[PDB]
Amino acid sequence: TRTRGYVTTKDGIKWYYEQEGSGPDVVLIPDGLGECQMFDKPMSLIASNGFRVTTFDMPGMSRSSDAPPETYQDITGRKLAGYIITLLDTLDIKIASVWGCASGASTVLALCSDYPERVRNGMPHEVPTENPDILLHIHEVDPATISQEMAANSRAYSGNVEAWDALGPEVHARLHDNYPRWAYGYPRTIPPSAPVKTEDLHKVPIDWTVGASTPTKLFFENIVIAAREGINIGTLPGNHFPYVSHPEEFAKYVVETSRKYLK
Amino acid sequence: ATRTRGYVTTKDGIKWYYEQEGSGPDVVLIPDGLGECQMFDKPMSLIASNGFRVTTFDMPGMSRSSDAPPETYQDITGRKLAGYIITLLDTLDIKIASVWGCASGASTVLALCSDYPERVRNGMPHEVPTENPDILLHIHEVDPATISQEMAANSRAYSGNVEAWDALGPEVHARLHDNYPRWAYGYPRTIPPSAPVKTEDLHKVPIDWTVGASTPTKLFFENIVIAAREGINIGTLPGNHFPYVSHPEEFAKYVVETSRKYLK
Numbered sequence: 001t002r003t004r005g006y007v008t009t010k011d012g013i014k015w016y017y018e019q020e021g022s023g024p025d026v027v028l029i030p031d032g033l034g035e036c037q038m039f040d041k042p043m044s045l046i047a048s049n050g051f052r053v054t055t056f057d058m059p060g061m062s063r064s065s066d067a068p069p070e071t072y073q074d075i076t077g078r079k080l081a082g083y084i085i086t087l088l089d090t091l092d093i094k095i096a097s098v099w100g101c102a103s104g105a106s107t108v109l110a111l112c113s114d115y116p117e118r119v120r121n122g123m124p125h126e127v128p129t130e131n132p133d134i135l136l137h138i139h140e141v142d143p144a145t146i147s148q149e150m151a152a153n154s155r156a157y158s159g160n161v162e163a164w165d166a167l168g169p170e171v172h173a174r175l176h177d178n179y180p181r182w183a184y185g186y187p188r189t190i191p192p193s194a195p196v197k198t199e200d201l202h203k204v205p206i207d208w209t210v211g212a213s214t215p216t217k218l219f220f221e222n223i224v225i226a227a228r229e230g231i232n233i234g235t236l237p238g239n240h241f242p243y244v245s246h247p248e249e250f251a252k253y254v255v256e257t258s259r260k261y262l263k
Numbered sequence: 264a265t266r267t268r269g270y271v272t273t274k275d276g277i278k279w280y281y282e283q284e285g286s287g288p289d290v291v292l293i294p295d296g297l298g299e300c301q302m303f304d305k306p307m308s309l310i311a312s313n314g315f316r317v318t319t320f321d322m323p324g325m326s327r328s329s330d331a332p333p334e335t336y337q338d339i340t341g342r343k344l345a346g347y348i349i350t351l352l353d354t355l356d357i358k359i360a361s362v363w364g365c366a367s368g369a370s371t372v373l374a375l376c377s378d379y380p381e382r383v384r385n386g387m388p389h390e391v392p393t394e395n396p397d398i399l400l401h402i403h404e405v406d407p408a409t410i411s412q413e414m415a416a417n418s419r420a421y422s423g424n425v426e427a428w429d430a431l432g433p434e435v436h437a438r439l440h441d442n443y444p445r446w447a448y449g450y451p452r453t454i455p456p457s458a459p460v461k462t463e464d465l466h467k468v469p470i471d472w473t474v475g476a477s478t479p480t481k482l483f484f485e486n487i488v489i490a491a492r493e494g495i496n497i498g499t500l501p502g503n504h505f506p507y508v509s510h511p512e513e514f515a516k517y518v519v520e521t522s523r524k525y526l527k
């Protein structure tokens with residue numbers, strides 16, 4: 001049964017989190033929008049396969065909004081990793097299979113690099129290493145404009161507009177307030193701090209993905225990096241939000257991939 | 264432009280339509296599967312103006328090169344095409360060249376780099392087919408009118424610039440209309456399995472590989488992984504499948520810059 005609630009960690013973040021299942025741990029880190037309701041459907045699916053799945057709204061975002069300003073400013077994968085480790089400690093999650101898209105992927109890599117002992121296997125998806133043109137000036141315009149532009153962009157990168165819309169009014173209202181905050185704290189600092197150096201990529205198993213429908217140039221570098229390093233690399237259906245666009249396929253991937261590493 | 268436009272019948276029976284412009288080191292522009300060289304009209308002059316002798320041609324059975332034996336456009340592979348092209352180069356007095364090619368054209372480039380390395384300065388393959396998208400799975404099973412309509416829409420949508428595509432002209436599109444069925448029956452089933460992407464195909468001459476920036480990742484995902492694991496220069500170009508049509512200037516610049524690196 002799904003549990004839903006809050007926990008305040010020692011860094012002051014009042015986290016909204018959810019959990020379902022029993023068995024080895026699976027952690028689902030959201031993308032930059034930090035909205036975990038996006039994992040609702042797949043979470044049940046993954047949990048039903050014998051895993052304890054944990055997800056949460058990111059610091060300062062959605063229901064995890066009661067957080068120190070520091071936790072949503074000058075964000076990097078390593079910064080988020082620290083926060084997540086503190087959360088995992090409080091939740092007594094010793095080791096986990098970890099998923100993450102975009103800033104979430106950066107966080108996955110940071111975890112694999114700096115906290116390898118806590119990671120079974122990492123599943124990064126679309127690690128930002130170079131922003132597209134649409135994000136160049138996003139941190140520079142007024143909040144209403146950021147929301148409007150980012151709501152459109154996200155929908156366009158959704159991989160399934162119907163499913164995107166079908167996330168619901170509550171989710172979309174939360175996203176609306178998240179966009180400006182995300183804009184000021186993420187796109188400028190996330191890409192330059194991508195943990196994609198040789199030294200970050202070999203401590204724990206990694207299975208890397210990019211969206212099947214995502215324009216090649218966007219995450220091209222992820223592919224080259226993975227291939228050059230000898231890391232498993234492939235695609236998932238959809239674009240930036242496979243968990244929303246293709247919940248069944250997404251769940252399958254997580255389950256199958258994590259299963260490879262159980263002992 | 265001061266461009267030669269002519270015909271030559273090679274020993275294999277193909278009556279080729281070819282174009283040539285400029286003087287200097289040779290650059291060869293191999294069309295994509297559609298085999299219409301008029302798509303290179305603009306960039307040809309641009310490349311030629313940078314000090315290169317540029318040659319192009321309609322592919323066997325296609326457009327103005329349509330007077331060719333059926334076997335030159337059936338059960339097509341990159342290696343088969345390479346054979347024909349080598350024969351053509353011999354008649355045109357081209358000894359070594361920088362070679363460009365997209366899709367089947369790219370398969371051809373690789374075949375040339377693998378099997379005729381002496382004739383290749385550097386190869387510039389773009390989107391080598393290794394696995395067809397679902398839209399092409401049954402394209403050979405239908406009748407010509409159906410193929411022409413389906414492929415004309417398919418090509419336009421993945422043109423990378425529908426305005427430019429349309430701007431090719433009705434003469435070009437009329438030629439294309441007839442090419443579509445021939446391409447379908449002879450290319451998609453055999454081009455992918457014969458992709459010269461094996462280790463031994465890729466290291467005899469310099470290769471600079473590209474994929475369309477706007478092309479869906481999955482389509483040519485394998486090109487990227489292969490190139491990367493093999494230590495081959497890999498990157499993107501604006502557009503999709505026809506950068507020479509969608510983005511003539513950027514295309515021309517890429518060819519020139521890339522070819523220039525290997526000149527003695």
Ligand SMILES: C[C@H]1CCC[C@H](O)CCC/C=C/c2cc(O)cc(O)c2C(=O)O1
Pocket residue numbers: 031032033101102103104128131132153154157182186187188190191240
């Ligand atoms: C919010 C999410 C998708 C927004 C739609 C946008 O259309 C996605 C464009 C791809 C870029 C994502 C991104 C880049 C960056 O520098 C930092 C980030 O946190 C992200 C990321 O999390 O993107």
Ligand SMILES: C[C@H]1CCC[C@H](O)CCC/C=C/c2cc(O)cc(O)c2C(=O)O1
Pocket residue numbers: 295296297365366367368392395396417418421446450451452454455504
């Ligand atoms: C005709 C051209 C583009 C057709 C439109 C389509 O949007 C191109 C989809 C990409 C695949 C092209 C292709 C596949 C193949 O197995 C053999 C080929 O000769 C081609 C090829 O030359 O593609």
